[PDB]
Each structure stands twice: as C-alpha cells, then as structure tokens.
Write an enzyme that holds these catalytic residues in place. Sequence first.
Site, PDB file in Angstrom:
ATOM      1  N   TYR A   3      -0.899 -34.110 -17.741  1.00  0.00           N
ATOM      2  CA  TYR A   3      -0.118 -32.877 -17.665  1.00  0.00           C
ATOM      3  C   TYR A   3       0.994 -32.799 -18.700  1.00  0.00           C
ATOM      4  CZ  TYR A   3      -2.591 -32.796 -13.215  1.00  0.00           C
ATOM      5  OH  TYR A   3      -3.568 -32.858 -12.245  1.00  0.00           O
ATOM      6  N   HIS A  18      -6.272 -42.324 -13.224  1.00  0.00           N
ATOM      7  CA  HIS A  18      -5.909 -41.097 -12.514  1.00  0.00           C
ATOM      8  C   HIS A  18      -7.049 -40.587 -11.634  1.00  0.00           C
ATOM      9  CE1 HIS A  18      -3.366 -37.138 -12.827  1.00  0.00           C
ATOM     10  NE2 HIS A  18      -3.635 -37.478 -11.578  1.00  0.00           N
ATOM     11  N   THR A  61       7.542 -33.711  -4.652  1.00  0.00           N
ATOM     12  CA  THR A  61       7.496 -32.843  -5.821  1.00  0.00           C
ATOM     13  C   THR A  61       8.567 -31.764  -5.878  1.00  0.00           C
ATOM     14  OG1 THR A  61       5.926 -31.409  -4.687  1.00  0.00           O
ATOM     15  CG2 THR A  61       5.013 -33.151  -6.116  1.00  0.00           C
ATOM     16  N   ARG A  91      16.409 -29.832  -0.755  1.00  0.00           N
ATOM     17  CA  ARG A  91      15.226 -30.537  -0.272  1.00  0.00           C
ATOM     18  C   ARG A  91      15.220 -31.991  -0.733  1.00  0.00           C
ATOM     19  NH1 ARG A  91      11.289 -27.376   3.227  1.00  0.00           N
ATOM     20  NH2 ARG A  91       9.759 -26.690   1.653  1.00  0.00           N
TER      21      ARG A  91
END
Length: 290
Positions: free
Chosen positions: A55, A112, A246, A252
């Site tokens: 990514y 991965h 994430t 959060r």
Amino acid sequence: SRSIMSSLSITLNDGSKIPWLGFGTGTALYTKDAEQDVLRAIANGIVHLDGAQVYGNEDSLGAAIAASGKPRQSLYVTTKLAAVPAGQNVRDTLVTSLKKLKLQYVDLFLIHTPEQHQGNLKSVWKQVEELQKEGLAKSIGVSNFRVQDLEEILDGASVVPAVNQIEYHPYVFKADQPVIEYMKKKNIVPTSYGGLTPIVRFKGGPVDPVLASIASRVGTTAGQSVSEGQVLQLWLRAKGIPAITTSSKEERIKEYLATETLPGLTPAEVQAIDEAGSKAHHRVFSKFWD
C-alpha cells in the site's frame, strides 16, 4: 515513557516480545494522512506499528518514527512482503522497505498473503528464513495463511513462523477454529486485524447486545465508561491475540490504550461472545479463505 518493555506484550516462539496493542497504516489512501495518523498513535502511547509494502505507506511510517522524537528501540515495527518484482528476490524487497522505513532491521517481516506466491511458498519462506539469519528481520512470520498454506511452508522448514496475522473478530470465530487449533499446536501466535468489524460494518448483528452487557460489567468493575469496541479488544486480549487497530481519532486511540489495562473478561463473557459471534459468518478480507 511507553516502550515495548513498559507495555503489555505476548511472547513469541523465538523468545521475543510483541506488544499486544498495535496500530497499522492499513489501506490509507494518502501518505500525508498516514504520517499524521502514525504520529498520533505514537504520541498517545502505542508502541507497535504495522506497515506493508503493497500500500506504499512505509515512507510515511518511517517519517513519523523519525518525527515523533521517540527512540526507535522503544518501538516494534512490522512490514510485509508483497509480490516480488520481476528480476528481484525477497531480500531485494526488504532492503527497499528498510530504506523507506529508515531502519537497519524490522522487528517482524511477514509474507502478506499466500495468493501472491502460488507455487513458490516453500522457496519464499526459505528466503525469509535467510533474512532472519542475515540480521535484517528479528522475527519472521506470515499473514492470511490457511492450514493448507502453513502445512506447505512447514514441510522441511528450519523456522516455524512466529505469527500468522489474520482477520479475527467474533464473526469469523466459528470458521477459523481449525486454523486457530493448528496454530496453537505449532505455537504460532495469531495476530488480529479487523477486530472492530462486528460493530463498524455489521452493527445490528447478534453480538451487539452481548457486547453491551459485558461493557456495562467491565465498566462497573473499572470505575469508568467502557464501549462495545473496547470489549471486542478485551476479547482478543483474553485469547492472547495482539490487536492491530486502524482508527486515527485521538479519542478512539485513547480508548484502545485503555483496553491494555481494563479488567479482563471472564470465561463466561468470552464464551458468550464466541457463541453470539458463531451465529453469523462475516468475512470482510481475504475472501479466498471461503
């Protein structure tokens, strides 16, 4: 100050410790956001950072580490092998990752996905084993490996993967029981991504009232308000499974940090989440597993 030593950790089959709470760049679209997200995660006390080749966010993860002011030795850094470019080998990809990360070694290097190495799994794993001998990856493991895939690379292997990073939350609990049992026999630690899937993507399913009941209990024991999301992480903590998160919101992120030290779930509470989650199958990633 928070470090690997000062944080809740899980021991791997090679003796090293991986922090239980992690933060991943994930599929963040803009590297500019990715850098700021990692800076926010480090500043709030997360000391396990999860990157990936595919990514393109290793540069921003490296820039954030440098810009945070926190010593690199306080942090656990993971990255993940994508596809091997034509004319290159596995070592070539890790050298490229380490230059982008601005590091001399990663704490953890993972394959991965087996789907990118079809017919070459044994060869790729041997190459990863050599990268550990070379000093470029402290520990080595895999991601999204089914039981079938683990059997393949374990045949004639000198190193058993330290971890298998997989999608893990109550709505894949029932389907994943075989690979969880296999990994336990081989002492491969599962690590979780997608831990909040039940309430982020499938709010209204059977686990929600169970999470609501347990959150009220944990919050009463702790003397503070506890959310359904925090219960989903305590479920992972109770199973000994590191949670890779994430979300970038500082509010959060502070919630995640609190789950490191909130009161643990009881056997009846873990079992109740297992059962309620087993009433539905929702696999969001790596659909080839189904």
